[PDB]
Amino acid sequence: MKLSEYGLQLQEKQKLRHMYGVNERQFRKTFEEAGKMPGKHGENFMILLESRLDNLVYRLGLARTRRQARQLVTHGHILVDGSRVNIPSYRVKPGQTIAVREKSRNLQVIKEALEANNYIPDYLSFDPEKMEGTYTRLPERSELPAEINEALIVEFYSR
To answer: How far is Cα 83 from Cα 99, in angstroms, rounded to an integer?
Structure first.
C-alpha cells in the first residue's frame, strides 16, 4: 500500500501510453504481437509503436503535431507503398514508403510542416519533391525516447 517499486512500473507504462497516445487495445495487442521477434519483447514494443502511421507522418515533418498527423491519416491522404491507409493503427515495415496523396499535397498543414523539419531519423529517407518517406531501415533505441523503459512493463504481464 505504501510507496513501492511495483507502482513506478505501471507508471512508466502510463506516461509511455500518453507519449504518442497509443490506445490500450493498440498497447496490449501490439505487445503480444511483438513477442514474435526474439529481439527482446521490450525493444520490439518500442519498435512497433514507431511504425504508428501517425508517428511516421509527424516525424517526416508532414504535420506539425499528432493532431495534424492523425487527421492526415484518417482523412485518407497518405499512400503507403502506393496505397491509401486511413488506418492509424496499421503498421509499416522496411520495403515500403509513405507517400502523401496528390489531392492532399498543397495542404497548408503539410506545406506548413515541411518547414518544421525537426531533423529526420537516419532510417527514414524523406524526398520532399515527391513527399515520399521511405522506411529504408528499422528504428534503433538510440533515437526512440531514452527517458522511457520497458522491462518494468515486461514483468507487468507476468502478474
So the answer is: 9
Buried b (16+ CB within 10 A) or exposed e, 19-53: ebebeeebeeebbeebeeeeeebbebbbbbbbbbb
Cell digits for 89? 493503427
Cell of 147: 527517458
List all residues 6 or more positions away from 120 whose beta carbon is below 8 Å from its beta carbon: 59, 60, 61, 126
- Spatial separation of the C-alpha atoms in residues 102 and 8, rounded to whole Å: 46
Q: CATH assignment of 1-51+140-159?
A: 1.10.1050.10
Buried b (16+ CB within 10 A) or exposed e, 60-91: bbbbbebebbbebbeeebbbbeeeebeebeeb
Cell numbers describing residue 123: 532510417
Q: Cβ contacts of residue 131 below 8 Å, gap of 6+?
A: 62, 99, 100, 105, 110
First-to-final CA distance of the chain? 17
Quote the radius of gyration of the chain (alpha carbons, Å).
Answer: 17
Sequence length of the chain is 159
Q: How far is CA 8 from the centre of its chain?
A: 24
Residue range(s) in the chain whose domain bears CATH number 3.10.290.10? 52-139
